[PDB]
Enzyme design. Sequence first.
Site, PDB file in Angstrom:
ATOM      1  N   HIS A 113      10.112  -7.349 102.466  1.00  0.00           N
ATOM      2  CA  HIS A 113       9.710  -7.667 103.836  1.00  0.00           C
ATOM      3  C   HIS A 113       8.412  -6.948 104.180  1.00  0.00           C
ATOM      4  O   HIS A 113       8.154  -5.859 103.673  1.00  0.00           O
ATOM      5  CB  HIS A 113      10.782  -7.239 104.851  1.00  0.00           C
ATOM      6  N   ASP A 151       8.978  -3.411 105.087  1.00  0.00           N
ATOM      7  CA  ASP A 151       9.394  -2.515 103.998  1.00  0.00           C
ATOM      8  C   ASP A 151       8.172  -1.822 103.398  1.00  0.00           C
ATOM      9  O   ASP A 151       8.260  -0.687 102.946  1.00  0.00           O
ATOM     10  CB  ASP A 151      10.107  -3.269 102.875  1.00  0.00           C
ATOM     11  N   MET A 170       8.136 -12.989  95.117  1.00  0.00           N
ATOM     12  CA  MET A 170       8.655 -13.428  96.410  1.00  0.00           C
ATOM     13  C   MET A 170       8.397 -12.336  97.447  1.00  0.00           C
ATOM     14  O   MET A 170       8.460 -11.156  97.131  1.00  0.00           O
ATOM     15  CB  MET A 170      10.165 -13.720  96.324  1.00  0.00           C
ATOM     16  N   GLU A 211      17.002 -19.009 103.656  1.00  0.00           N
ATOM     17  CA  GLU A 211      18.186 -18.301 103.202  1.00  0.00           C
ATOM     18  C   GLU A 211      19.279 -18.442 104.246  1.00  0.00           C
ATOM     19  O   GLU A 211      19.187 -17.870 105.334  1.00  0.00           O
ATOM     20  CB  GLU A 211      17.870 -16.830 102.947  1.00  0.00           C
ATOM     21  N   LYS A 265      22.935 -17.902 106.106  1.00  0.00           N
ATOM     22  CA  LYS A 265      24.015 -16.940 106.258  1.00  0.00           C
ATOM     23  C   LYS A 265      24.874 -17.373 107.435  1.00  0.00           C
ATOM     24  O   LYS A 265      24.348 -17.745 108.475  1.00  0.00           O
ATOM     25  CB  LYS A 265      23.446 -15.533 106.484  1.00  0.00           C
ATOM     26  N   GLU A 296      22.353 -16.885  98.810  1.00  0.00           N
ATOM     27  CA  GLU A 296      22.859 -15.579  98.398  1.00  0.00           C
ATOM     28  C   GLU A 296      24.365 -15.672  98.120  1.00  0.00           C
ATOM     29  O   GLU A 296      25.119 -16.208  98.933  1.00  0.00           O
ATOM     30  CB  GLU A 296      22.579 -14.537  99.479  1.00  0.00           C
ATOM     31  N   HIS A 350      26.665 -14.551 100.918  1.00  0.00           N
ATOM     32  CA  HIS A 350      26.534 -15.269 102.178  1.00  0.00           C
ATOM     33  C   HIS A 350      27.458 -16.499 102.187  1.00  0.00           C
ATOM     34  O   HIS A 350      28.183 -16.725 103.153  1.00  0.00           O
ATOM     35  CB  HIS A 350      25.059 -15.624 102.436  1.00  0.00           C
ATOM     36  N   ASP A 381      19.467 -15.222  95.511  1.00  0.00           N
ATOM     37  CA  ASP A 381      19.829 -13.825  95.728  1.00  0.00           C
ATOM     38  C   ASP A 381      21.187 -13.555  95.072  1.00  0.00           C
ATOM     39  O   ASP A 381      22.173 -14.233  95.379  1.00  0.00           O
ATOM     40  CB  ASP A 381      19.897 -13.496  97.229  1.00  0.00           C
ATOM     41  N   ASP A 436      29.041  -8.533 105.382  1.00  0.00           N
ATOM     42  CA  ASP A 436      28.166  -8.710 104.223  1.00  0.00           C
ATOM     43  C   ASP A 436      28.114  -7.396 103.422  1.00  0.00           C
ATOM     44  O   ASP A 436      27.547  -6.419 103.880  1.00  0.00           O
ATOM     45  CB  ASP A 436      26.770  -9.159 104.695  1.00  0.00           C
ATOM     46  N   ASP A 467      27.065  -6.837 100.086  1.00  0.00           N
ATOM     47  CA  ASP A 467      25.901  -6.661  99.209  1.00  0.00           C
ATOM     48  C   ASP A 467      26.231  -5.686  98.063  1.00  0.00           C
ATOM     49  O   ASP A 467      25.443  -4.800  97.755  1.00  0.00           O
ATOM     50  CB  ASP A 467      24.681  -6.164  99.997  1.00  0.00           C
ATOM     51  N   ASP A 485      19.629  -9.073  95.824  1.00  0.00           N
ATOM     52  CA  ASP A 485      19.696  -8.568  97.181  1.00  0.00           C
ATOM     53  C   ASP A 485      21.020  -7.840  97.346  1.00  0.00           C
ATOM     54  O   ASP A 485      22.021  -8.438  97.720  1.00  0.00           O
ATOM     55  CB  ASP A 485      19.521  -9.700  98.205  1.00  0.00           C
TER      56      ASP A 485
HETATM   57 MN   LIG Z   1      19.579 -12.063 100.851  1.00  0.00          MN
HETATM   58 MN   LIG Z   2      23.842 -10.105 102.093  1.00  0.00          MN
END
Ligand SMILES: [Mn+2]
Ligand SMILES: [Mn+2]
Lengths: 385, 385, 385, 385
Positions: B52, B55, B86, B179, B181, B215, B218, B243, B253, B255, B285
């Site tokens: 991002h 980031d 990406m 993406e 979710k 993802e 997700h 992802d 979520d 992850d 991710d």
């Molecule tokens: Mn993601």
């Molecule tokens: Mn996630």
Amino acid sequence: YQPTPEDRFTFGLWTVGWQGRDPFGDATRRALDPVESVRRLAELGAHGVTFHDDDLIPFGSSDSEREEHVKRFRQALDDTGMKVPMATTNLFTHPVFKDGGFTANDRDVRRYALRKTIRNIDLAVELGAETYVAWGGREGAESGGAKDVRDALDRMKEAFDLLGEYVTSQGYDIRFAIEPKPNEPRGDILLPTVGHALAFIERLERPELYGVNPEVGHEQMAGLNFPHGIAQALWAGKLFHIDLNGQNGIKYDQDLRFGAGDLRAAFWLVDLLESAGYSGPRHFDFKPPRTEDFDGVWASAAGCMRNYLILKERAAAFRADPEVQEALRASRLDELARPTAADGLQALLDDRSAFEEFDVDAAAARGMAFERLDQLAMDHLLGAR
Amino acid sequence: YQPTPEDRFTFGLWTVGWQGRDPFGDATRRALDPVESVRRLAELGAHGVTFHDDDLIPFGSSDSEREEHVKRFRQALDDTGMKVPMATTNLFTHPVFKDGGFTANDRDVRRYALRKTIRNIDLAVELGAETYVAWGGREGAESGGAKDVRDALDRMKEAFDLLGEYVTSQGYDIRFAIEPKPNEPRGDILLPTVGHALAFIERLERPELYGVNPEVGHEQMAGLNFPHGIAQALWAGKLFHIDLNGQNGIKYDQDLRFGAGDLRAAFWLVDLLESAGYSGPRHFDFKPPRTEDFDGVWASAAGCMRNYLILKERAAAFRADPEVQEALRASRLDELARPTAADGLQALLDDRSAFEEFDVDAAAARGMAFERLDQLAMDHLLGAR
Amino acid sequence: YQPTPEDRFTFGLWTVGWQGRDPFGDATRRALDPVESVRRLAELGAHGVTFHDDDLIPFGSSDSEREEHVKRFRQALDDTGMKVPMATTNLFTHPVFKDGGFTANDRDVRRYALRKTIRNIDLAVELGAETYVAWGGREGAESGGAKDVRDALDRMKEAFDLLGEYVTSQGYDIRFAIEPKPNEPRGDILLPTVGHALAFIERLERPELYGVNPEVGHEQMAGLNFPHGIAQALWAGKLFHIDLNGQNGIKYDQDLRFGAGDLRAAFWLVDLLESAGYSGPRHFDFKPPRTEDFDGVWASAAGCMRNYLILKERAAAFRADPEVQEALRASRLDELARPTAADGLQALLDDRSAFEEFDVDAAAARGMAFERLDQLAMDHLLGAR
Amino acid sequence: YQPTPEDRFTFGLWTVGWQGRDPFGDATRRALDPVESVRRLAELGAHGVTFHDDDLIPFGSSDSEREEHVKRFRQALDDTGMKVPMATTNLFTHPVFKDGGFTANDRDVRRYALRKTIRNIDLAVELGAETYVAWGGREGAESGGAKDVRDALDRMKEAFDLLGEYVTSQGYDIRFAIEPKPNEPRGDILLPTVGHALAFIERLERPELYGVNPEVGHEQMAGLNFPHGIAQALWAGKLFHIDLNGQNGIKYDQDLRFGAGDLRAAFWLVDLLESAGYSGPRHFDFKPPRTEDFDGVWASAAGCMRNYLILKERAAAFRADPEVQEALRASRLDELARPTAADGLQALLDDRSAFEEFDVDAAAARGMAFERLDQLAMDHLLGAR
Ligand SMILES: [Mn+2]
Ligand SMILES: [Mn+2]
Ligand SMILES: [Mn+2]
Ligand SMILES: [Mn+2]
Ligand SMILES: [Mn+2]
Ligand SMILES: [Mn+2]
Ligand SMILES: [Mn+2]
Ligand SMILES: [Mn+2]
């Protein structure tokens, strides 16, 4: 909250006619004559009924048996002025369909599925169905190796394309509505949500011929927001039909009467349908719990329509309330309707107010006032205004 | 199972960089310098990193601060030969985005969101990104009145259309990947599944410019079959990016590192990606659990790649096994690949073997042999063959 | 539907004081002074407030800072006559607790957790708390190897036993209430439901000292029926306290205002609490959505109490309605209250009416009339009688 | 991975015997003679079989019909040396049980349910069952008014107390195991989880006579961690029996073969059972998918046992691995096993190292090393070490 036929309430034969067999239970009710169902639903203020082929004509019926079943049904319809706005195929009950109809691994089964469907399309047209629903309940898998989903989607497109070719060749006005469901009876079902079905349709040869028949309970079996899904279907111009019932979140398909399960979701659904001016059937795909006798069946059916009408009243009062209208402005629902950049890309790029000189902190500090709005909605639902 | 660059494994800065703040918890780890992340990931055999905007460049940075951050990052990339396939915008963290970016009720926020995105698209292209991801994590609602979803989808389409106009205008080769979710951090998020995102894309002015970045976790948050979703995306030609991570069914979520959560699903995913010859990044991710120190961070990241490579081996062995090839035939996976009616509609209609003369009972009696096939799959996954 | 202090509505400092940090978002609101919270909640008709230690006294406070925080708080309470019926420990936020408090793998952390708790028990008693809540949010695991659950339950019992020994040694009247949650922030949390907590308590040295503090949203995160769970807690004599909020089925912990989420569940909960004569606090553990400013915070808080009072009215009207009373008889709710075999085992064995001469078909044919009853309940909820 | 009798693998008649009727589907397989089931299961290396009364003796059988069914079954058992370690009552299939057995609103049904149970307890004991299972699948509600849960729990306790009195009176050694399930076929089922069942048992007159029979799929239908649940059951000394199968998170009860569904969960379950030295049957309550013929039935059953044995090998290898033993130390699993404060309350209170002088930051900084440990677990499961 008395239903009238103008309300366009419809019921599947298989709803009030559900004998109460479940995966752990034998029937608790005797079979209903479709003729009785037509007459009783008419008395309750229904607009119409719907059917699977095999609801009206027992599987394996002779041509003469078939003729007699349909004749009796049409006499009941003609007597009462009840309509048949939608029909569908049973491609799930018979063991031949244990791995699907249109996406059965066995090619001979896929061909049979199509012929079975086409036969009933003809009957649907005779009975005046505007929509032909396809719920691919057996399309999918319990295991990863069993089903190549790319191949399955190829077969599904082929099937739907052939159905499109057929209706076109016959000059039928009937349109198709694909009914998503995420799972049950298959471990996972293909086109599991409104989204997947909408996406699939875009890849058909004649997409204009196909929409969705979303069901409250089905989307909620994926923990999805049904009103949101219906909004996207409406946005796509693809809400040909809708199935109304109740579901308590993520478990087996309960098919409670409409209004049961997620009450607030039912409110926001009715708000949306009425606000959008959805003109299609208000169809109930529900099961009177097997606890019930026939008095309970008709009470449950009546409850479907009653709950719609209460929610309709409450949603209308919400929207008509000047206090709510001000709350909507406070929450900038009206600003949401304004184009973001009707001034165009270059204008946006050159607009210092949009970046360089945008006061992020001032914008951030603005409350959305969503909680006041939502409590107005709650007050209206509960008639506590 | 040593990862090497040609395996195309990539990580977000925000993954290994996660300081372990959750809704109930303060940070358990100090902030990582992106330069260190690049170096450590390179040593583990990563191909690339992603970011991002926020980031890489702290929100609200001066031009001199921005240049210094990008300078240091570029030096790390150049030193290691790490790629940036990406990048993406943060339109969720800052309070200004509390009701969304592209579908904020406030018009000025929508415009800001676009300008913030476009700024980072330029940087993404500079650093060699082929894909620009959009996760609209703040697009949605906690309450029914707060968001008119039809209006929101109008605004969302406008936004993505403008981004398409921008990349076209600059002669960029970069493509967008939306993406999905279902929820979190909004009560319900717009475009909640691969399906909804695919459907939406078809209504954009330049659909060829947009795919999905699904993802694992997700789709599984909606209890959906991720391999099935990926299959539909591939079918649509829209798997621009993916992802990879782990999730334990329907909850927040998680992850988890790839391979954790639903291990079987991970197997069937890798089988599909490899079979389909997906050539995009294998992007993780994920969040190293906040229980971990930095040694645990790098172990977790290494685990992502290790698990992919084990599963790749096992899937290849499965598909290569003569016993599996025989089982697939026994289950008529080969029949699934054959057109249902290449003889055409009229031939199908005239084919008595497809209806009148079809032995439904003989067809129904044929076992699918799916359980034998799946146990071969299990044996191969567990290395018990 | 105006709340009065006699209604025993209470709020956590951390509820109206939630600054709106979530896993993807920074704070959207400034910190609240507990003193302001006390005064504002009093104005709204609240009975009392509750606190974690670290809500009232910032972690790492000097003794003199601690004294000043408590002094100011007590001045506000004394000024308004607001009560503090419940208090609890924060054993989740500080990174030291990343693998738990009472069941941290690190023994030194477990001891610290107990000392931190004991300190706050003393403060709770000073402030007149009748209940001390323990939510073990960090007790559990993301992975199988991380936590031997038998060992963890040994440590959990040890901790709770020591707390019991402490209150007994001090001659405190305060009782403990364990708050179940199935997951979040840990991948799985120990004692995940009301059931698990009730079972665990029975194995404590002094079970009489411990009950449950069930939360609407928490049970619903496991897709469980909250009213059913509360019924079992009441049956066990173990409903010491309750947390009221809203949740939309199985996802992250939403902590919506009470009445939001599952509205019908809220109705049946209030019906049960009032019918059972629950005399404990009606405590709201909720978060004003981070979309909201402080006007929205107080609106959301007010909505909690309003919704309870509406539901209380509707549940009372339901139960008072002679038509409903007859429906309950029709459905044999009254027969459910009759002992099955007060005549004893031998009598039952010797009773031919109970087997040999039991007309199973006649019994089976009896409709339960549940749908009529439920539509009466719906009518009452919606004020459509 | 050849199963042999000493592996204690058992199957319900109703498992391999499932004809494949589901809520949307007719039978895909002919009824199995229990005699054939016994013989085929014996050939696969099964230890034993189990039955509902109505699996072995068709409901409403004459004494002569009953004797003939039992005679043939006993001959099969004697021929093969197959054991019957467990049996159970069908209190769910017959319409009379549509509102429950033990907690039917109708008193006469409750009494019938008990007599039906007691009849089968005698037969169970004759055939050598050490455990008598009760799954109250019809105990619950679809609607809030239909069931007073406090009254229902009163009736449930009465029923189980009477069954305890009966076995005591006859000098039987057989013990009861209550099988929880959250939902299906009732909208919500009473005693929905291992927790609720454990709690309930503690309130019975003779708690020593009752444990739990947890099922993998059932706990996972509430999104719960099955190994964690089994751990609590073991902790309570109440794991009298266990049902092994597969389930894909929160949906209808799938009853996949063991190893399918959540593979990781299966691993950690077997690790726990073997570590704890559970000595009870490894019982499979599963359904061969209705896609399958009889060859597929026996393949699926063989798969149950194969998967257990693979997982057993991998779990043993995990625990034996010096590298894993080191990782467990690194993660302080050994510290978890040590009492928190065997020095006692006063010593804890007086220990400045536990509070005033505790270096919270130094403790917080210690990584738990859980990810390294879990990847060792993954490597062992996948045979990649
Ligand atoms: Mn993601
Ligand atoms: Mn996630
Ligand atoms: Mn349904
Ligand atoms: Mn439907
Ligand atoms: Mn909560
Ligand atoms: Mn709480
Ligand atoms: Mn089951
Ligand atoms: Mn079972």
